[PDB]
Amino acid sequence: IETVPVKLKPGMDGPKVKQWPLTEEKIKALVEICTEMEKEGKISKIGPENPYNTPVFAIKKKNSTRWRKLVDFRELNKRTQDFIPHPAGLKKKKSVTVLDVGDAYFSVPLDEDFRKYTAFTIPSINNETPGIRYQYNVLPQGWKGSPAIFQSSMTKILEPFRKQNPDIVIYQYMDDLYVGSDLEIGQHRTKIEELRQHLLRWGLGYELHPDKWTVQPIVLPEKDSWTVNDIQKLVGKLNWASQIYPGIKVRQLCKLLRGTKALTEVIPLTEEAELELAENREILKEPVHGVYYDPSKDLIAEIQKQGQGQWTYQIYQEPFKNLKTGKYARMTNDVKQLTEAVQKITTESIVIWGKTPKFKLPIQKETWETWWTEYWQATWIPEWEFVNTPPLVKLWYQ
Amino acid sequence: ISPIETVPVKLKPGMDGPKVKQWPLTEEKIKALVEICTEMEKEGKISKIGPENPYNTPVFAIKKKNSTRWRKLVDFRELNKRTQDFWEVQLGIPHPAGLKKKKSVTVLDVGDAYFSVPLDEDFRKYTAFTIPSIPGIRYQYNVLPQGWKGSPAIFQSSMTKILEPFRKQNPDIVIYQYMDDLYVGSDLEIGQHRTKIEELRQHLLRWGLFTPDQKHQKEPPFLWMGYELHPDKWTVQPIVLPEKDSWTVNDIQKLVGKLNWASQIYPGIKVRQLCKLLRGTKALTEVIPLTEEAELELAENREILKEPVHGVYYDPSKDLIAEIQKQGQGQWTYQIYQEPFKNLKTGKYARMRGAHTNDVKQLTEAVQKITTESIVIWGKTPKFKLPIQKETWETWWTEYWQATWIPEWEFVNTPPLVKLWYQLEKEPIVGAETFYVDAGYVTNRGRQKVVTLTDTTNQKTELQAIYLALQDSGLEVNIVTDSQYALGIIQAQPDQSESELVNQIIEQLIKKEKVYLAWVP
Ligand SMILES: CCN1c2cc([N+](=O)[O-])ccc2N(C)C(=O)c2cccnc21
């Protein structure tokens, strides 16, 4: 049909990302998948004159013996020109469902001159074979340009439904489609199933409950008798929280700490100390006022391993100015748990601010890079960096 | 020239073709060049060009290594500079262990077949050169220029396209590409193998690729990149340890390198003592006398290298089993085998990630390296056998802040087993003396000792205090400190470190019955 012209950001050039090694099973899947795609004119093999590259992966569908190709267009997207805002109401909805409409992009062809940039490669085992090279002919799944270009086509397909069911909220993000409503689950699932048929009419799983999302506040130990050690930790924890909630006072507590007392010694709290603690709890009872989301700022996410399958994350833009804080329990091994945690958070950031957060993961790169795909099921890949969690921060959460 | 689809070449954006002046040459050379050039035009490799072409590239005559006859050479450096980047691929070498056992392998010298592969029609003009008149003769390339940027990549792809059909109808054969060589293998009977080789040899000839007649061909084992490849076994090529009297610094380094190369198959190869010889080396020419330990290490290594060991090839039918052993502090030997104690590859791990660590964490890291390694060579993870107990693992695991995971493994009782020498108390010790450290300490029992260092760094002081605390306390100690640094380090339960102080502290920790470290502002 008509290939809308798309370019890179001024001066910028196509991506040249190295393909992370892959298990045979993964490769065979990507071989199978890409093959049928080549037959269908969706992708074509490329020659050595295409020096560009983007990593590809093979993940597993949610409850289905099928693999889904996952191209990591992150770098490309960051180099692609700029081009639906965000239903604030969505985060209030009782039930939201996510659908993978990525397949729609395959009906629209990508601007011939841009195609070379979507060059990806199926890696070979032990560098024995040159490797299979391909480039997209149509709008590629995962590319930021795809949703934008398919926006017009999409909107047209969305109004016989939107205006026929104004009670439904449909938000698109990359290859996903967030459909929220307040119909009791029985009805909700039906409306979803119906939208699917409605979509099939034009040739085109995960279910959330945002209304139930709550922010995990900073807590303090409530105990019978307080020991010197407990008081030390109480003070230390407060001293940290005082930077966010400056109304926190430690004075009276530190007084109880006067003298090199035995760590295990029980120290009765003076009324002034009891009350000071009482106040500190009240202050901590709610998130610091003034935390306002800024669209022009990156959404940062930090996670901490609490052990036994428990995890704590905080979404903020400016340090300590957390837009959200949440907890996570196993639903497994650290990596799996992590990947699930990451995905969950991302999904939330999307529903909330309509953007993906940048993660700071408590794990080694080689470890993550090796196993993350083994548990990943999302259609997008959030940005991530690896760090070393300071023992103090952990003790200050949960 | 060959009937293959030409690969479209283009110059890097906004750039013009090479306009480099031909640097004058000898008449005798000019004569030679004209002779070789005409020969090529006859073969359609190059064709004369008219004054229309303003591009030029320097050509010169050189004699082949050890022989008396001219050779034409073109300095495509500038054109290379101007040529677009090609997907030149990765610079990764396929480790032999990932190759399967073949009853027959044949290598074909695919050197000059380069010249058989055509050059992009609209690009040819850029490859212009000129042999000066002692009525000038201007030429350009019609095929892939030797020494040109896109020659290797384009050749590789073209080669793959040519082989693809043959590979398709002959899935019993295995043709593997690698530079100017074409390694071919199969489990076919010798006689039939020779035929397939001929069928392939001529399959290339059909496309125009000049190949070597089986008569004048290289015979196994193949000396391939430091290795020695037999159709059913491999090993590193003859590694001979010099029997010197005086060892130069450079020499020790060369030696150490060789030794490491062997470690990938030869178990027990150690270089620690040799490495030590390098401490304070003022010159690559300096001579360092071997220490008795180094003498022993060199001799021992020498012995191991005196019995031609051989690595096994990969068998997709058998599982990959990886085993790990602690060779020394920080050194971990490992070997991956398929059939009971008959490895495809072996290796060592010493990568100390961090200034302070513990065996468990180090073992983990070793496991990861291997896992990565296995996926690279065999595209699959090996079932690990580890000298650690599920318990010990689980303990450190659940309590460490960093997330981690180890692929399917089984405990193996082959000491030394990796363990945790000391564990800090989760709650303060009742009846244990309390030490308030900041360089000196004060205890709840009045005891206080404060002194002054002389070289210490702010952070070094903090640990000195805790060390003191440990040193003067009883079996159970409660230590309070403000240094999140020392605290964190000690909370990491390190058993080894680069700083002598930390190790001393670790020693103390190991000797204590109960230790509880506490942090305060
Ligand atoms: C023909 C395959 N061949 C082989 C393959 C290879 N590769 O894939 O990178 C590299 C070298 C190589 N050579 C030289 C062999 O002799 C060999 C030996 C055993 C099995 N395949 C061998």
Query: What is the distance in angstroms between the CA of the first residue and the CA of the last residue of chain B?
Result: 79
Residues in chain A: 398
Portion 98-117 of B in contact with A at CB < 8 A: 98
Q: Is B520 left (phi over 0), alpha (psi -120 to 50) or beta?
A: beta
Tell me which residue in B7, B368, B397 faces A47 most closely, judged by beta carbons: B7
**A230 assigned ligand-binding residue:** no
Resolution rounded to one decimal, in angstroms: 3.0
B161 in Cβ contact with B5 (< 8 Å): yes
A327 in Cβ contact with A216 (< 8 Å): yes
H or E segment at A177? strand A176-181
Give the helix ranges, DSSP H, for B358-516.
359-378, 390-399, 458-472, 484-491, 500-511
A127–B429 CB contact, under 8 Å: no
Domain extents for chain A? 1-86+106-146, 89-105+147-207, 208-293, 294-395
Tell me which amino acid residue A376 is.
W
Which protein residue's CA is at the shortest distance from atom 9 of ligand 1? A128
Q: Is the peptide bond preceding residue A390 cis, with omega within 30 degrees of 0?
A: no
Angle at A53 between CA B365 and CA B125, to 5 degrees: 135
Which architecture does CATH list for B422-518? 2-Layer Sandwich (3.30)
Chain B residues within an 8 Å CB radius of A308: 398
Contact status of B379 with chain A (Cβ, < 8 Å): yes
Which protein residue's CA is at the shortest distance from atom 18 of ligand 1? B231
Residue B426 buriedness (CB in 10 A; 0-12 / 13-18 / 19+): exposed
Residues in chain B: 521
Which architecture does CATH list for B1-89+115-151? Roll (3.10)
Ligand 1 geometric centre to CA of B185 (Å): 7
Does A89-105+147-207 match A1-86+106-146 at the fold level?
no
| Fold adopted by A294-395 | Alpha-Beta Plaits (3.30.70)
| Residue with tokens 């791990």, as numbered in its chain | B349
What pairs with residue B236 in β-bridges? B227
Chain B residues within an 8 Å CB radius of A236: 519-521
A324 in Cβ contact with A217 (< 8 Å): no
What does the alpha-carbon distance between residue A336 and residue A344 come to, in Å, rounded to a whole number?
12
- What CA–CA distances, in Å, run from A225 to A233, B383, B520? 14, 51, 20
How many CB atoms sit inside 10 A of residue A268's CB?
9
A306 in Cβ contact with A325 (< 8 Å): no
Q: In what order do the strands lie in the sheet with B331-339?
A: B342-349, B331-339, B321-328, B383-386, B409-411
Tell me which amino acid residue A83 is.
F
Tell me which residue in B365, B402, B429 faces A389 most closely, judged by beta carbons: B402
What pairs with residue B385 in β-bridges? B323, B410
Structure-token pair, residue B423: 């564990």
Contact status of A18 with chain B (Cβ, < 8 Å): yes
Positive or negative: CA dihedral A181, A185, A188, A192: positive
Report phi then psi at B283, rounded to 5: -160, 145
**Which residues' Cβ are closer than 6 Å to ligand 1?**
A 128; B 94, 99, 102, 105, 107, 174, 176, 178, 183-185, 222, 224, 229, 231
Chain A residues within an 8 Å CB radius of B379: 21-24, 27, 125-126
- What CA–CA distances, in Å, run from A329 to A308, A311, B402? 8, 6, 16
Indicate the class that CATH gives domain A89-105+147-207: alpha beta
Query: What is the distance in angstroms between the CA of the first residue and the CA of the last residue of chain A?
Result: 56
Torsion angle, CA of A304/A306/A307/A313, rounded to 10 degrees? -50
Contact status of B92 with chain A (Cβ, < 8 Å): yes
| Fold adopted by A1-86+106-146 | HIV Type 1 Reverse Transcriptase; Chain A, domain 1 (3.10.10)
Tell me which amino acid residue B136 is.
G
A285 in Cβ contact with A264 (< 8 Å): no
For domain B315-421, is the CATH number 3.30.70.270?
A: yes
Residue B512 Cα, gap to closest chain A Cα (Å): 18
Q: What share of chain B is helix, strand, coil (3-state, %, to 5)?
A: 35, 25, 45
Tell me which amino acid residue A181 is.
S
Helix axes A228-241, A271-284, angle to 10 degrees: 40
Domain extents for chain B? 1-89+115-151, 90-114+152-220, 221-314, 315-421, 422-518
Q: What is the DSSP letter of A115?
A: H
Report phi then psi at A388, rounded to 5: -115, 100
Q: What is the DSSP letter of A137?
A: S
What does the alpha-carbon distance between residue A284 and residue A243 come to, in Å, rounded to a whole number?
12
Torsion angle, CA of A169/A171/A175/A176, rounded to 10 degrees? -50
Give the helix ranges, DSSP H, for B104-150.
113-116
Q: Which CATH number fits domain B90-114+152-220: 3.30.70.270, 3.30.390.50, 3.40.50.620, 3.40.50.300?
A: 3.30.70.270
Structure-token pair, residue B382: 């090996």
Q: What would you measure as the largest C-alpha separation in chain B, in angstroms?
A: 107
Chain A residues within an 8 Å CB radius of B7: 47-49
Best mutation site among B102, B170, B176 for ligand 1, i.e. most ligand atoms within 8 A of its Cβ? B176
B174 in Cβ contact with B186 (< 8 Å): yes
Helix (H, G, I), strand (E, B) or coil at B35: helix
A336 in Cβ contact with A60 (< 8 Å): no
Torsion angle, CA of B211/B57/B76/B147, rounded to 10 degrees? 10
What does the alpha-carbon distance between residue A211 and residue A169 come to, in Å, rounded to a whole number?
14
What does the alpha-carbon distance between residue B227 and residue B235 come to, in Å, rounded to a whole number?
6
Positive or negative: CA dihedral B38, B44, B46, B48: positive
B86–A49 CB contact, under 8 Å: yes
- Under 8 Å CB pairs connecting chains A and B tally to 168
What does the alpha-carbon distance between residue B57 and residue B126 come to, in Å, rounded to a whole number?
8
Closest CA to A46 of B89, B53, B106: B89
Q: In what order do the strands lie in the sheet with B104-109?
A: B104-109, B181-186, B173-178
What does the alpha-carbon distance between residue A396 and residue A242 come to, in Å, rounded to a whole number?
12
Closest CA to B122 of B247, B235, B242, B9: B9
CATH superfamily of A208-293: Reverse transcriptase/Diguanylate cyclase domain (3.30.70.270)
Q: Which CATH number fits domain B221-314: 3.30.70.270, 3.40.50.800, 3.20.20.10, 3.30.70.260?
A: 3.30.70.270
Helix (H, G, I), strand (E, B) or coil at B443: strand
